Design a protein that fits this description.
Two copies of one chain form a homodimer. Chain A is built from 33 helices and 25 strands. By secondary structure, chain A is α/β, with parallel strands linked by helices. Chain A has two domains: 483 residues, Glycogen Phosphorylase B (Rossmann fold), CATH 3.40.50; 327 residues, Rossmann fold. In chain A, the strands form six sheets. In chain A, strands 1, 4, 7, 8, 11, 12, 13, 14, 18 and 19 form a ten-stranded mixed beta sheet that branches. A six-stranded parallel beta sheet of chain A has the order 22-21-20-23-24-25, with helices on both faces. In chain A, a hairpin with a 6-residue loop joins strand 11 and strand 12. In chain A, helix 28 crosses helix 29. The longest helix of chain A has 30 residues. Chain A starts with 9 loop residues before the first helix and ends in an 11-residue tail after the last helix. Chains A and B meet through helix 2, strand 6, strand 7 and helix 7 of A and helix 2, strand 6, strand 7 and helix 7 of B. The structure holds 1-beta-D-glucopyranosyl-5-methylpyrimidine-2,4(1H,3H)-dione (4 copies) and pyridoxal-5'-phosphate (PLP) (2 copies). The PDB classes it as transferase.
């Protein structure tokens, strides 16, 4: 059909068809008379999977032969989404499979919709790991992703009566064709017990054992025949576990609960024991696997030359003391030598400055669950503080500020401090974020070891986020500059010479319209809701959180509604406001925000006077697969976090690459995006980080804005009086109270400039040609945000390895 | 290699090899450089499995087309054992696979030892179901086995310090290549709730729902291209289950625990709630599946003409009231019509007369868990008793004796009475057992409905129990009479004309010697224990239970030991006494018996004076795979249960078919075996059922035997004084006390005749030629004990269907 989707050769199509029929028969044990669409999806999945195996086996054999330095990316989250289309894209099998299935009388798109998302993540942090795996494979790095195979991923979100309802994500119900269980590589992990100090060294004894069984999933690079591995551990009880008889067998669940479910929190630390067990479980199994592979290549001096461990936030921070435990207690290295190896091996990536999101574990928890690790952490702290004391003699407050151990009600271990002390590199995820780290929360550390601090601006993979989800745009682009940009996104800059090209301007606008039509149809198909495809698609999709300020968006929507009701026969650019995202189960304010959004829609969407000029829709169950549908259809991307709170953001990059203009604050990567495209091509508004600090020093008083802005006052009175909740007048009292008395994110402070900026957006939308030319300027300068660029920087500046675009013999 | 193992054609061997390499690559994702023996086993299993699929699909399509009457065998146990070799045997692929693997540089026998036993049963009852499935497929019956897919089967038995230790049987750890999950056919099962009586009919509401997911396993008939299905249900929690959030997800285990583990009791009823849930779970899911298939063929009058439900004991007895519930409550049939259909559809098989083994559920349990079923059971009882009252006016005691409801401390439901009332056929499993049923426990029922009572003597499949485990014997037999006997065991009678054939006598004896050498080697391989292959192999393998009297065997062993110590230089036929079997975890006396056996061995096996003249070995972890090894190597089969307690026995039949002579009581099938071979060719001893009754009427006093038998007295004094337990003098006080004061099984009463009979056995063993001729007379008359004969009788006399030996086009 389209160029970028590969060739549909005569031989290959014939081959695909026979293997499809083979799997349907032998693998699924069905015939065309009883097979259902799901049966067909699996037949196709196994057929495509077969094409991965050969490359997968030789890639791993290749690394064994050449023995390059290995990169281990440790993360408690891998937000993978669907795998079928992505695999076809990277193997250049899309058109061939589309043709083969077509000839078999099947619609491949219909089959792709049957696959369950691998929702092993919460949002940005988990998606970043997924994009990174893709880029590492595309750049020929010998990388391995290590995590946990959660039986239940992020919950499926249902909206009932305008409220969020959660239901288990039983994603493995029908089986996972992509994974390969490797029970032969099962490893033991220890918990509890006590420490015994003998003649030579300490010993961790009387521990409870839980087995870690690995499941391997292939990670194909883009058309380079490289297939890396993502290894996820599953918890298994030993067979002598607890060994009345029946009860002993049933109690095995206690041990296996470790890999049962993903904690649904985003940017919020919950110090639960089960979460701590998950963190140590992944770290303990992974390190044994790493050391085993290292020895199968005694000389731990070369360990840092053959191994790089990247910590995705502090979740896997226990890798530092676990590595020390193994080297000191088991391998018998002297402390100093062990510490040198550990620091040169580990690197830490920070993703937030919000205090409530930082991991600070109570000492009594570590004391009971991991007694040996607590001792090692105290020793690390002692030696670290001696260094601080020697560098800043007499600065006693610095000593208490930098300590890994926090004193107070209950003593806690600051995992971020542990990571900085035990890593040779610490990085932020966007320039402004990395600078804030050095000026605020990690200032003392930066002054002690300035060389450790770096920046690695985030990125997204252009395979899934352009070619896969927006083939139409990928096609018209390839028509002008070729296909090389797919693995070298900087080439998009060549599109600048087409900004005045009437043919291109028309094609870009046509693709957007088609995407919007397709999405508008989807909304009626699976959700039954009518929308006007000619309206401006205003969307904000991301997890629900006060710092992301979905509430500011709500204030604007209500403002637009009140303005229409005031002057009904006045023309206004039609808009479809879409907001989607999940709220953590115990995050009350976040759940109230969801209810507010649906409540607004209930009023706005049924007001005769408004007509099709304004619609407010809440996108249910936002996840990777849904993102791939709504992002290509967006006109306006809402990135309005309070300046200084969104470390980077990545959804913002996905919208920019897909033809949507951005309205946002100078926060996270928004700053670099505007810098790349030019501020004139971005809709920037609101307080800058410096402005927020000035307001805090002075004291934020929301009452002042309420008193000076009539339109704002009206909205607050509508909320308090029950205008949006007739049957429950005080339903939103908590929201009004927070906004008026304890809003940490200054929603009112950016209200005026936001509304004004939104007016400028509507003004531009009225001029199709100029709107599209600005879009072209954005797409053309989005190259810097490819995760390929990000990974190349990690490789050269942190891991010490050179990326490669060389194909492997298939 | 050998004839009965099929042809090793040039084309097929080449084909097998390429498919083996294909699976190793694509399925297991490995190469010859990293593949382990387990990897090779799986490659072979998938290769053989492929040969089953084609036949499996067409067999099921065949039944759909011809729509014959369907046979549903409901059982909570299916003791399948290994599947690889059995599949090769039934498909005539053994020699081809042996050659193909040989050419690949692999030893197939070594690979077969890697497969885990599917130990979804406890013993005889579970093994009978497995043999039956095999015979039903071989006889072309449209049969389906329905049970539960236990995550953990019968526990693995370890012997530590002479004591039984139990460990979880994690048989699915490495995956099960034979099964095929069918999540698309998942069905809901209800529990708890309450009954609501509305205008039209009652309704079961407010129930808790548990999903039943089916897993299908193919059951190949012997070389007839028929492949039936064994469908096992697995418990799954609904996704809205219990829907803090984390806890709700973890609590899903509560619902899924239903299919977690097999209750390890044998001939003993344990009224636990979880067991009741398992029983209803299998019945509820199965009946919905049956009705669904029936409708896809409104006219329930023809239901009995298209469906037959066989209840393996009372475990699935809830099928009777569940069928009534569906027909009355859901289909809206009038009670009388529904009852007619139910009775004509159901048939019940009883397997014991021991009071402690009969299921008698407390009403309060049924009341809480299955309120609607309790009501239906009371109604059934009411109408049944009205019939009894009309047939035997004024006989009030008969009414209370026959009631389904037992009064007393706590009211209970007698499930056996429920089964008789709701079934058109009730059968025992051996002639003597079926007669005892009519004269004792079911006497009142027999007098009311004599036509319902039948006998169906048990049998074993000659495929697994001869061809598979003893190819050597199968071969020399085929050499003389051909291969037809494998599916027509009665033909073995032709071997009688060879009883005086010197060549045959020599071959039979040679095969036994080779089997014994192979087993003697195995004992040193996996268990490190030296034994003399020239000694008489005396073995008793079966679950440990007081009624089976392993204790009587122990008394004989000690007697032999004391006699040797008394006259050391006197010649005695060398013996290796082997006893094996598992004890239920909470069966104290059974665990003490195991300890006694190892204790005896500890003394006997290390006494210099005894030498290699006597050895006592306890066969650890007796299971199907071990039975296939030890039975072909046995010389003497111990079947010594107290007359009237072993309903039938099946191990006895396995020994007879494999060339071992039998020493036993006139109990169960032993009676018919001796009748077939001739009492002169059997070693019968002890009390007959009539003798046991006389002793009970008079009162059994063990003291009398102790006072009159010096050798017996000596043994009891050795046990009481600590001769077999130096460090723990009173260790066996419980055993001595039971034997002397409350032995329900009269061990002492059969001691004298047993020892005398054993002397006659030793006398015959000294004459190799005559021992072997008697063996030939046994093998030649074992034809009646083929489960093919048993199933043909069930088909014609109970299910109303004709068996067929017609091949299906492959
Ligand atoms: C799961 C979760 C909870 N919370 C809040 O944490 C506060 C301090 O523990 C509580 O008082 C409040 O009720 C919670 O909704 C958040 O802010 N974000 C979150 O993701
Ligand atoms: C601590 C934390 C950060 N992040 C996000 O990680 C993304 C990838 O680095 C950033 O772009 C985004 O700004 C962050 O808020 C999450 O999603 N969950 C989290 O718990
Ligand atoms: C599991 C089990 C228990 N028991 C006995 O049941 C008796 C009555 O409940 C108990 O007093 C005794 O301690 C048990 O060992 C048996 O006989 N057979 C068995 O299979
Ligand atoms: C009640 C019951 C019977 N049986 C056996 O079933 C076999 C097959 O019918 C018989 O040969 C044998 O005599 C019985 O004791 C068991 O194994 N477990 C049991 O719980
Ligand atoms: C890209 C992505 C995110 C991150 O979006 P932000 O707006 O940066 O928070 C979260 N969820 C999904 C499903 C995503 O695809
Ligand atoms: C045949 C068999 C049984 C039944 O043996 P009996 O002596 O009749 O009780 C029990 N266990 C296994 C493993 C068997 O193969």
């Amino acid at each position: 059909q389209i160029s970028v989707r590969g060739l549909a050769g005569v031989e290959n199509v014939t081959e695909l068809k026979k293997n499809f029929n083979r799997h349907l028969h032998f693998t699924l044990v069905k015939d065309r008379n009883v097979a259902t669409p799901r049966d067909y999806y699996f037949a196709l999945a196994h057929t495509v999977r077969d094409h991965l195996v050969g490359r997968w086996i030789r890639t791993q054999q290749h690394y064994y032969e050449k023995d390059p330095k290995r990169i281990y990316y440790l993360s408690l989250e891998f937000y993978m989404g669907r795998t079928l289309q992505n695999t076809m894209v990277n193997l250049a099998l899309e058109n061939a499979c589309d043709e083969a299935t077509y000839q078999l009388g099947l619609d491949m798109e219909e089959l792709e919709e049957i696959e369950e998302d691998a929702g092993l993540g919460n949002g940005g942090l988990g998606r970043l790991a997924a994009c990174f795996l893709d880029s590492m494979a595309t750049l020929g790095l010998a990388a391995y992703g290590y995590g946990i195979r959660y039986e239940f991923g992020i919950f499926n979100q249902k909206i009932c009566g305008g409220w969020q309802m959660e239901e288990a994500d039983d994603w493995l119900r029908y089986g996972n064709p992509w994974e390969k269980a490797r029970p032969e590589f099962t490893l033991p992990v220890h918990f509890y017990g006590r420490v015994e100090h003998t003649s030579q060294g300490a010993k961790w004894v009387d521990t409870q054992v839980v087995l870690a069984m690995p499941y391997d999933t292939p990670v194909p690079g883009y058309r380079n025949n490289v297939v890396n591995t993502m290894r996820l551990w599953s918890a298994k009880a030993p067979n002598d576990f607890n060994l009345g008889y029946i009860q002993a067998v049933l109690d095995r669940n206690l041990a296996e609960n470790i890999s049962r479910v993903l904690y649904p929190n985003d940017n919020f630390f919950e110090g639960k024991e089960l979460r701590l067990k998950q963190e140590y479980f992944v770290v303990a199994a992974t390190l044994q696997d790493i050391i085993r592979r290292f020895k199968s290549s005694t000389n731990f001096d070369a360990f840092p030359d053959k191994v790089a461990i990247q910590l995705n936030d502090t979740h896997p921070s226990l890798a530092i003391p676990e590595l020390m435990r193994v080297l000191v207690d088991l391998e018998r290295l002297d402390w100093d030598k062990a510490w040198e190896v550990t620091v040169k091996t580990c690197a830490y990536t920070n993703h937030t400055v919000l205090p409530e999101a930082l991991e600070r574990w109570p000492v009594h928890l570590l004391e009971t669950l991991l007694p040996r690790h607590l001792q090692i952490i105290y020793e690390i702290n002692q030696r670290f503080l001696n260094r601080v004391a020697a560098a800043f003699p007499g600065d006693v407050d610095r000593l208490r500020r930098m300590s890994l151990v926090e004193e107070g009600a209950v003593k806690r271990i600051n995992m971020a401090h542990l990571c900085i002390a035990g890593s040779h590199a610490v990085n932020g995820v966007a320039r402004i974020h990395s600078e804030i780290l050095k000026k605020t929360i990690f200032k003392d550390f930066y002054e002690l070891e300035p060389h450790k601090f770096q920046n690695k601006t985030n990125g997204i993979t252009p395979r899934r986020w352009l070619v896969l989800c927006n083939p139409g745009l990928a096609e018209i682009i390839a028509e002008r500059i070729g296909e090389e940009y797919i693995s070298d996104l900087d080439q998009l800059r060549k599109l600048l010479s087409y900004v005045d090209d009437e043919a291109f301007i028309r094609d870009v606008a046509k693709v957007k319209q088609e995407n919007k039509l397709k999405f508008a149809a989807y909304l009626e198909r699976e959700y039954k809701v009518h929308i006007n495809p000619n309206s401006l698609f205003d969307v904000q999709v991301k997890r629900i959180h006060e710092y992301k300020r979905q509430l500011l968006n709500c204030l604007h929507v209500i403002t637009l509604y009140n303005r229409i009701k005031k002057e009904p026969n006045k023309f206004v650019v039609p808009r479809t406001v879409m907001i989607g995202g999940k709220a953590a189960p115990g995050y009350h304010m976040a759940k109230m925000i969801i209810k507010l959004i649906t409540a607004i829609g209930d009023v706005v969407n049924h007001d005769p006077v408004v007509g099709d000029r304004l619609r407010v829709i809440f996108l249910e169950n936002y996840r990777v697969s849904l993102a791939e549908k709504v992002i290509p259809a967006a006109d306006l991307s809402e990135q309005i976090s309070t300046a200084g709170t969104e470390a980077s953001g990545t959804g913002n990059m996905k919208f920019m690459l897909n033809g949507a203009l951005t309205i946002g604050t100078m926060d996270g990567a928004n700053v670099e995006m505007a810098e790349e495209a030019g501020e004139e091509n971005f809709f920037i508004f609101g307080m800058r980080v410096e402005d927020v600090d000035r307001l805090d020093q002075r004291g934020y008083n929301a009452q002042e804005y309420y008193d000076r802005i009539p339109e704002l006052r009206q909205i607050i009175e509508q909320l308090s009086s029950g205008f949006f909740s007739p049957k429950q007048p005080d339903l939103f009292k908590d929201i009004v109270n927070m906004l008026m008395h304890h809003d940490r994110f200054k929603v009112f402070a950016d209200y005026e400039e936001y509304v004004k900026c939104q007016e400028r957006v509507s003004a531009l939308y009225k001029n199709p040609r100029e709107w599209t030319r600005m879009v072209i300027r954005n797409i053309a300068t989005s190259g810097k945000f490819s995760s390929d660029r990000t990974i190349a920087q990690y490789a050269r500046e942190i891991w010490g390895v050179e990326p490669s675009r060389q194909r492997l013999p298939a």
